[PDB]
């Protein structure tokens, strides 16, 4: 109900009751401890699904990877009691992440023998069985990508009295594609607004008209952004959207900036990504008529340590459209090197 | 941005960065000081309006009238010092409200005098004359409705909310019909969502594909609801919105209900009104086929003071729509008496 609400801008104390939006991306690791609903049923579901030819599962966000790594071998211990000749493995995430054509079913009955829910199962770690099951990772050679499910878990409830929130997740009963909304949120106040998610932070300001100010990214999802949690959903050109529609971008007039278009060849291969409208460290940008056309993004720093001190583009509004990542600094697609061929420059990975 | 919170029913608590809202409807108009620009400059404003032929001013909300009532006599003191025969008279507001076809001008010069208006050592006094610059009220005789300006101010700062409470207001420089977004707010989270302002509060629930849950109203504002501070602004029909666009109703699929249409002929004469989906005491509603038509809203209590029991309607869905205010209980337009279609009941006049 009540909140501290210390306004840094004018040092104001302010109290009442209403709705609260929190920035939780910066500290994702320690806020969660997931678990299925009665793993006795999850084991049966995974066993039944494998019989239909499904090979593995591709994660949708780092949260699911953390959950799978946490449960890890515990599944084999329970499976052993029923004599299941199957083994499950857990991999690792990579940027970006693709979809999964298939989906998981829901069992009609649970295991016939075995009444274990939770407990002593921490004291077992077995070896391979006659069959193998894989999840994420560098396992492109085991089974093709077209044999795995994707985005099949719902969020029944969020938040609990442990601080390792015992969020209950289970398989969806229906067929759907949109990103899970139970954790999404957004709000607007005065001359500021932001759309929030577990791994997304987008800020908008009103200087002149609604536009982009800053954004923080930890992962690239590929699920449709729910429209019913968006601001100003009127018709807008898909080109102008800075965040591509494919990368779970919001469908809002806020999500745009005049003079720039969709960025489908951005450095999505980077582990961590932040979008800021400031030039790369020590570099500079200009708007020029005779510059090159749209093309793959170029890193401002060469693999040999050489930096590029010239850039240009025609329709851009000066000076930056910059990306920030652990590996260095990049630029938007519209920007091109002024007097350097792309052959002698570190071309950004083209995942478009 | 930095604050704390405690969940309504859950035990979750924290103090982290984010964006927060609280209701400001039932606080009943906290005692703010309201610096309408420098009163020295504002004195030159009304001079041109009266000189050009503006006689009266209508109100847009129950906040401008309070500012006028706060400043009052000091305005007459300025003209008394400068020697101009004019004054102001203030009434009370009645609902519904009506818009005006005029707007105030912007002076380019300051009144030549030693400003003794604001910060002076008390001693503010004046007398009454016949040159009445009536604001608000039923005094149409001195100034007809079509000669009154409306919504000719603009917010500049909402700070000092702790101790000084001096929201800065200044006359706008350009013509427009939209409201002032500087105080408007709206947010959504998970299974709940609500739109709020200084005089409205609407709650929408995620029970099944969104539907109106409950709302609170204190003044029947008729300003133009902004589109840049609302969710899901496309894919709706104006015939379904519970609050018609003329009444500043938000344009959103959230702002609707299944089995009901607009309520342009509702009981908009009360002072404070709350929308609740529940049968009024004693009374009940039956969904039948042989009911009447979409007539003007009818009061739930006869003029003699006794309640009317039986009603009917076709497109309704339990619970029925209802309006509740101090005067009593009112039902929806689609809901008419069942057995007797007689008009021997208190009825609301045509509104549009």
């Amino acid at each position, epitope marked *: 109900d009540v909140g501290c609400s210390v306004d840094f801008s004018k040092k104001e104390t302010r109290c009442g009751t209403g709705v609260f939006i929190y920035n939780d991306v910066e500290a994702w690791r320690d806020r969660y401890k997931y678990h299925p609903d009665s793993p006795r049923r999850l084991a049966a579901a995974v066993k039944q699904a494998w019989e239909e*030819g499904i090979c593995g599962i591709s994660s949708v966000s780092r949260m699911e990877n953390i959950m799978w790594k946490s449960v890890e071998g515990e599944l084999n211990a329970i499976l052993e009691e029923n004599g299941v000749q199957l083994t499950v493995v857990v991999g690792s995430v990579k940027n970006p992440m*693709w*979809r999964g*054509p*298939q*989906r998981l079913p829901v069992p009609v009955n649970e295991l016939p023998h075995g009444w274990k829910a939770w407990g002593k199962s921490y004291f077992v770690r077995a070896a391979k069985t006659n069959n193998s099951f894989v999840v994420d990772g560098d396992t492109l050679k085991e089974c093709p*990508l*077209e*044999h795995r499910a994707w985005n099949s878990f719902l969020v029944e409830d969020h938040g609990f009295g442990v601080f390792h929130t015992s969020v209950w997740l289970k398989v969806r009963e*229906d*067929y*759907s594609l*949109e990103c899970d909304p139970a954790v999404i949120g957004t709000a607007v106040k005065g001359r500021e607004a932001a759309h929030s998610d577990l791994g997304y932070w987008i800020e908008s300001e009103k200087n002149d008209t609604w536009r982009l100010k800053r954004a923080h990214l930890i992962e690239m999802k590929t699920c449709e952004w*729910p*429209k*019913s949690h968006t601001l100003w959903t009127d018709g807008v050109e898909e080109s102008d959207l800075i965040i591509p*529609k*494919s990368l779970a971008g919001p469908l809002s007039h806020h999500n745009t900036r005049e003079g720039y278009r969709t960025q489908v060849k951005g450095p999505w291969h980077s582990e961590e990504l932040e979008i800021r409208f400031e030039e790369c460290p020590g570099t500079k940008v200009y708007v020029e008529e005779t510059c090159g056309t749209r093309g793959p993004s170029l890193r401002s720093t060469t693999a040999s340590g050489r930096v590029i001190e010239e850039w240009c583009c025609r329709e851009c509004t000066m000076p930056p459209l910059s990306f920030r990542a652990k590996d260095g600094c990049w630029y938007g697609m519209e920007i091109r090197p002024r007097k350097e061929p792309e052959s002698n420059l570190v071309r950004s990975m083209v995942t*478009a | 941005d930095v604050g704390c919170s405690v969940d309504f029913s859950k035990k979750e608590t924290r103090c982290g960065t984010g964006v927060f809202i609280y209701n400001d409807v039932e606080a009943w108009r906290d005692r703010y000081k309201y610096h309408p620009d420098s009163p020295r400059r504002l004195a030159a404003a009304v001079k041109q309006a009266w000189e050009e032929g503006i006689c009266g001013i209508s109100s847009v909300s129950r906040m401008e009238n309070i500012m006028w009532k706060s400043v009052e006599g000091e305005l007459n003191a300025i003209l008394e010092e400068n020697g101009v025969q004019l004054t102001v008279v203030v009434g009370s507001v009645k609902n519904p409200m009506w818009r005006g076809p005029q707007r105030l001008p912007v002076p380019v010069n300051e009144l030549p005098h030693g400003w003794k208006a604001w910060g002076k050592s008390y001693f503010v006094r004046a007398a009454k004359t016949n040159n009445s610059f009536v604001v608000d009220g039923d005094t149409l005789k001195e100034c007809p409705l079509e000669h009154r300006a409306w919504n000719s101010f603009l917010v500049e700062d909402h700070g000092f909310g702790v101790f000084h409470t001096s929201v800065w207001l200044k006359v706008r420089e350009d013509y427009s019909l939209e409201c002032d977004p500087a105080v408007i707010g709206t947010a959504v989270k998970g299974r709940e969502a609500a739109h709020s302002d200084l005089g409205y509060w609407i709650e929408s629930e995620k029970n099944d*594909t*969104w539907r109106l849950k409950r709302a609170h109203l204190i003044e029947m504002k008729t300003c133009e609801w902004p589109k840049s501070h609302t969710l899901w602004t496309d*894919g709706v029909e104006e015939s379904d919105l519970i609050i018609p666009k003329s009444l500043a109703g938000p344009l959103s*699929h959230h702002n609707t209900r299944e089995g009901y249409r607009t309520q342009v002929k509702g009981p908009w004469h009360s002072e404070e009104l709350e929308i609740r989906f529940e049968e009024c005491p004693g009374t009940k509603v039956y969904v039948e086929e042989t009911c009447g038509t979409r007539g003007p809203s009818l009061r739930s209590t006869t003029a003699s003071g006794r309640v009317i029991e039986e009603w009917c309607c076709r497109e309704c869905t339990m619970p029925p729509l209802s309006f509740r205010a101090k005067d009593g209980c009112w039902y929806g337009m689609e809901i008419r008496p069942r057995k007797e279609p007689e008009s021997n009941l208190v009825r609301s006049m045509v509104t549009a």
Partner: antibody
Amino acid sequence: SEVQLVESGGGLIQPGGSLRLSCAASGFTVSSNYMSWVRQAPGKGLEWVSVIYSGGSTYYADSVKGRFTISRDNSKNTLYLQMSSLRAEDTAVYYCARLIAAAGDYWGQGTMVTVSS
Amino acid sequence: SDIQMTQSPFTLSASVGDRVTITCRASQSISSYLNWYQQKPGKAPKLLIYAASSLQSGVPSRFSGSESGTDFTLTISSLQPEDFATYYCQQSYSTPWTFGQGTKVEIKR
């Protein structure tokens, strides 16, 4: 009961008019799935008109955006479609296609719509 | 436009027991969101292969399909007299969703 699909509402309308189309169903629930309209021009291939999500979202193709309207009555498990500003070029046979790209599709008998003076 | 769907060749001829292959190509990588539709004249269309790799329960499994980067294919191990109809290529990745031009199989004489 088993799945049955039946279209209706077709006929002969004058140019510039408006008409409604419906697609009833039995068994499964239309509220929790995806539905779309498919039309086949005379002697041509199929074509996709619009799609409605189970969550209430909709998207329209370029040829018809800004002229149609679709909604479903979940109380009795029925789907309705509306169109405005008709023209001769729109004459075709329309189906309410159960376009589920993974599980499967059930298709009805279709209905004929004609525009001519 | 976002996605274009192309079918080639337009029509082919064969006989009973012959092996026939149909190809379908897209303009960019859109994963395996793709299905084929079979249409008999005077009857409603039907779906035979879903997810570009699996066949529905029904007529015996004499149908096949695969993918390699950006190309798709449909093949019949042995033609039967009831297999002379029209086939279509369709995708459901990103809006707007398009359809293929179609292909026909006819008796050879």
